[PDB]
């Protein structure tokens, strides 16, 4: 019964770590793909000029 | 026909319909001699779906006014795609086959099916 409440802290900690890491990865790949598509738009603007 | 010009739902539904019809054509050779008894249910379901859809491709255009004496009908594309998605889902499999001959829309489909 004493041991019962041990792993819950681990579960909460890993949930928080997962949430922050997935938010970081989503932000990074979002900004990267947006920048690449913006650069492609600039390239095609130069091409049409 | 290309996803860059046409909606994704249209492309996906068309691809699925083609795949089902091609599979039925492939199994048509074997079913021709033995039948459905040896065939497993996992293919009986797609056989029934294919028969129902290929019967649903029929239509009653106005052009037959002087042959069958019945008015034709027209259908918007959105209704067509939604009805075909519903049919591919398998919701209509309980309905009888002969209800899908020469029908205009899904409302007429339901009315004819309930009329028998």
């Amino acid at each position: 019964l004493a041991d019962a409440d041990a792993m819950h802290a681990k579960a909460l900690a890993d949930a928080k770590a997962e949430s922050e890491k997935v938010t970081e990865e989503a932000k990074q790949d979002s900004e990267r793909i947006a920048a690449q598509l913006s650069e492609q738009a600039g390239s095609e603007a130069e091409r049409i000029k | 026909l290309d996803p860059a010009i046409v909606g994704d739902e249209h492309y996906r539904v068309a691809q699925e319909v083609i795949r089902i019809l091609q599979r039925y054509k492939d199994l048509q050779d074997i079913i021709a001699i033995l039948g459905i008894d040896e065939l497993s249910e996992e293919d009986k379901q797609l056989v029934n779906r294919a028969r129902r859809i290929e019967r649903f491709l029929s239509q009653n255009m106005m052009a037959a006014e002087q042959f069958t004496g019945q008015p034709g009908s027209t259908v918007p594309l959105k209704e067509t795609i939604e009805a075909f998605d519903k049919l591919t889902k398998g919701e209509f499999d309980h309905l009888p086959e002969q209800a899908f001959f020469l029908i205009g829309g899904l409302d007429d489909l339901a009315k004819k099916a309930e009329s028998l």
């Binding site: 990865e25 790949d29 | 083609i18």
Partner: protein, 182 residues
């Protein structure tokens, strides 16, 4: 020196390239392709050929043993892996990574319906983490044991993190009693 056969039946089946591996052949062989490709992939055309032959042969088999079922699963995974949609240019490193992960049986756990998407996912994660491994290929044209161990550890960690989204007329029987009815 070599030709590729294309058929409409495979096109309608779902294989977009729709190339028949049973007949296509090249006389020049693998001497043209890179050494890392040769080391990673070898006799894959053979394995696919026995897979197709076994599928045609045992389409109606009553019982299957462990070896046949395992071969069937592996061939299904490989045949679904090789499919590629239109307008999808790719680099050699990503191709060799995909072939390496497909051939070693690391993806045997996932069901068929999600084998494709998962691949497209992992290629993204390697882009931001441990990217230098790709760099190594560009200046080695070959794999190293340390890099291979790093890659297998990374994919194991990812697959541990990754989750799978799929998965009257009635008769009676009585007894006769000689005793008169009460």
């Amino acid at each position: 020196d070599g030709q590729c056969f294309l058929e409409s039946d495979l096109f309608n089946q779902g294989v977009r390239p729709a190339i028949n591996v049973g007949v296509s052949v090249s006389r020049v062989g693998g001497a043209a392709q890179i050494k890392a490709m040769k080391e990673v992939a070898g006799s894959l055309r053979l394995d696919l050929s026995q897979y197709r032959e076994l599928e045609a042969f045992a389409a109606f088999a009553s019982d299957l043993d462990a070896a046949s079922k395992a071969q069937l699963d592996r061939g299904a995974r490989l045949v679904e892996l090789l499919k590629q949609p239109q307008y999808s240019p790719l680099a050699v490193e990503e191709q060799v990574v995909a072939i390496f992960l497909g051939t070693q049986g690391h993806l045997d756990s996932v069901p068929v319906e999600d084998v494709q998407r998962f691949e497209s996912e992992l290629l993204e994660h390697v882009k931001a983490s441990h990217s230098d491994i790709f760099d190594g290929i560009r200046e080695t044209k070959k794999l190293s044991e340390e890099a291979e161990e790093k890659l297998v550890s990374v994919i194991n960690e990812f697959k541990k993190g990754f989750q799978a989204s799929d998965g009257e007329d009635l008769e009676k029987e009585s007894v006769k009693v000689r005793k008169p009815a009460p």
